[PDB]
Design a protein around this ligand. Structure first.
Ligand SMILES: CC[C@@H](CO)Nc1nc(NCc2ccc(-c3ccccn3)cc2)c2ncn(C(C)C)c2n1
Lengths: 308, 251
């Protein structure tokens, strides 16, 4: 016998076309009737001994809530006739594969735009009490018609003003903020804005700017580009236990603008990056105040994308 | 958006009816499931919010599925298992099997956690949770009248007492009625304040505008409807033993 199921379609209505990722198992696919291309994330029921995975529920909670031109779009959820597929609009590019490919080239106008869409995408989700927690170029997709989308809300979680006790083991190392590396469990938006700083740089450098082998190593690269962590710079750092219980230089001066003059020419662009890569979270630029930065309001003005 | 709101003509012609189940009967199959849910939820030390969510899941679930194929005693634990995850109060699958068991078989001893018998019922629950998910088509973010209750009670400077009563009404509207399948949270909330007031002889000074307390909460709400519904709710409250004594003024 079979069971009635009006609001879950069998994923067989799409035809798979190709693997593309890389948590978890992600295919491009085509709707058998219309040709509409989509992406399908299978939900991995392996090592899942507690029924349908709570984190999948979290993500699906969040994707249903975040509806916005700069946030990836969950179209529907599908079953087989056993597992479960998340179904998104398909995005033709991702910013990582654009920054590696060397024929791809960015004008200042095109870059201002990308950043603008990305800072807007952030403002939106933060405004909706969501933390993305996985900033990295590889999670920043772009569409053929040139619109940017943020992706992988697999690590996203909601946040509030309750003190909090959020997980620390978040964010790819190369994009993890200082705050986190010092064992902080009461953080918020400014962690996502650190990511954006790194990606903003990665726009002129084609490469992740701080590639560390471990926390120790990483934190050291950061204190090397943004100076040492002192309470004169970042008031109340001493309050953390991992503070002294860790090797950190002491004679380090902020070379944020110095090291990047090479690839980044625009001085407004530099001034912006410098407010994104700020050690102290509570002094690190808002996603609002950043969109309001003279970088977005000076020539060249931000332009559309056809430099594909 | 109107997906899980149904007319009285739709509510009558329900999956269960089409398998011979009388209206009055189906109606008490729900009440029963709701009891099981509350019973289990208190022993599992989860919130009322979580219990309420599970109940709404149960309600919507049976607007698609029939009681003649899916027994309440099977759906209720799986629905609560789910609601608890979805609401941040996750309870362990083995833990929920245990409590469901003692609730449904207060005498019978628990099977060896290693037996083929027990290994099945765990399988079953997990399968069921999967069917509930697909049946709801993964829409698990519920909104309960209770949120709106706070709001309506600032709008009458109501005492603790009257406030608590309104919540009581709210929670009971889920156990005892199919309102959550017919009227939006905000409306139901107004119904719950209306009857809490009636039950307490609490007075509502018309605003200076000639405006009533409710129009501030939901435009679509008419007293003609408020009276109609608080009647319906009160009617079944009276049918339900001991429930009213809970808010009766013994003094
Ligand atoms: C965490 C998410 C990351 C990790 O995998 N990725 C990702 N990349 C996409 N595309 C950009 C691309 C498009 C096509 C390919 C390709 C590769 C081989 C063969 C054919 N095509 C690869 C990447 C993409 N498009 C829609 N989605 C949703 C599921 C959000 C997408 N998610």
């Amino acid at each position: 016998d079979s069971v009635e199921c009006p609001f879950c379609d069998e994923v067989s209505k799409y035809e798979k076309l190709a693997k593309i990722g890389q948590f978890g198992e992600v295919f491009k696919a085509r709707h058998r009737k219309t040709g509409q291309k989509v992406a399908l994330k299978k939900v991995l029921m392996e090592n899942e001994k507690e029924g349908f995975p709570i984190t999948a529920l979290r993500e699906i909670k969040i994707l249903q809530l975040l509806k916005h031109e700069n946030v990836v779009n969950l179209i529907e959820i599908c079953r087989t006739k056993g597992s479960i597929y998340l179904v998104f609009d398909f995005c033709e590019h991702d910013l990582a594969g654009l920054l590696s490919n060397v024929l791809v080239k960015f004008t200042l106008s095109e870059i201002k735009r990308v950043m603008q869409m990305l800072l807007n995408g952030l403002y939106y989700i933060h405004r909706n009490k969501i933390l993305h927690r996985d900033m990295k170029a590889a999670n920043v997709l772009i569409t053929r018609d040139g619109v940017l989308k943020l992706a992988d809300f697999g690590l996203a979680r909601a946040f509030s003003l309750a003190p909090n006790r959020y997980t620390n083991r978040v964010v790819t190392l190369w994009y993890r903020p200082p705050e986190l590396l010092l064992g902080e469990r009461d953080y918020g938006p400014p962690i996502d804005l650190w990511g954006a700083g790194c990606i903003m740089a990665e726009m002129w450098t084609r490469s992740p700017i701080m590639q560390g082998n471990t926390e120790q190593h990483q934190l050291a690269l950061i204190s090397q580009l943004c100076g040492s962590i002192t309470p004169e710079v970042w008031p109340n750092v001493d309050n953390y236990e991992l503070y002294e219980k860790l090797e950190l230089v002491k004679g380090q001066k902020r070379k944020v603008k110095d090291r990047l003059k090479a690839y980044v020419r625009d001085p407004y662009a530099l001034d912006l990056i410098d407010k994104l890569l700020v050690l102290d979270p509570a002094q690190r630029i808002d996603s609002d105040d950043a969109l309001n930065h003279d970088f977005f309001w000076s020539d060249p003005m931000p332009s559309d994308l056809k430099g594909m | 958006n109107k997906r899980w709101y149904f007319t009285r003509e739709q509510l009558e012609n329900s999956p269960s009816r089409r398998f011979g189940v009388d209206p009055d009967k189906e109606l008490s199959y729900r009440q029963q499931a709701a009891n099981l849910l509350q019973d289990m939820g208190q022993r599992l030390n989860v919130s009322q919010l979580t219990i309420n969510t599970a109940i709404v899941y149960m309600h919507r679930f049976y607007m698609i599925q029939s009681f003649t194929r899916f027994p309440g005693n099977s759906v209720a634990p799986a629905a609560l298992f789910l609601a608890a995850k979805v609401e941040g109060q996750p309870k362990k699958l083995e833990h929920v099997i245990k409590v469901a068991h003692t609730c449904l078989h207060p005498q019978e001893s628990l099977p060896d956690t290693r037996s083929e018998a027990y290994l099945q019922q765990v399988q079953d629950l997990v399968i069921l949770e999967s069917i509930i998910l697909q049946t709801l088509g993964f829409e698990l973010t519920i909104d309960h009248p209770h949120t709106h209750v706070v709001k309506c009670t600032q709008l009458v400077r109501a005492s603790k007492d009257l406030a608590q009563t309104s919540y009581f009404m709210a929670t009971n509207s889920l156990h005892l009625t199919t309102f959550s399948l017919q009227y939006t949270p905000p409306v139901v909330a107004c119904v719950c304040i209306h009857l809490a007031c009636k039950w307490s002889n609490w007075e509502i000074p018309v605003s200076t505008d000639g405006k009533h307390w409710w129009e501030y909460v939901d435009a679509t709400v008419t007293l003609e409807l408020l009276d109609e519904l608080t009647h319906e709710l009160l009617q079944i409250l009276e049918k339900t033993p001991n429930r009213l004594k809970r808010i009766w003024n013994w003094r």
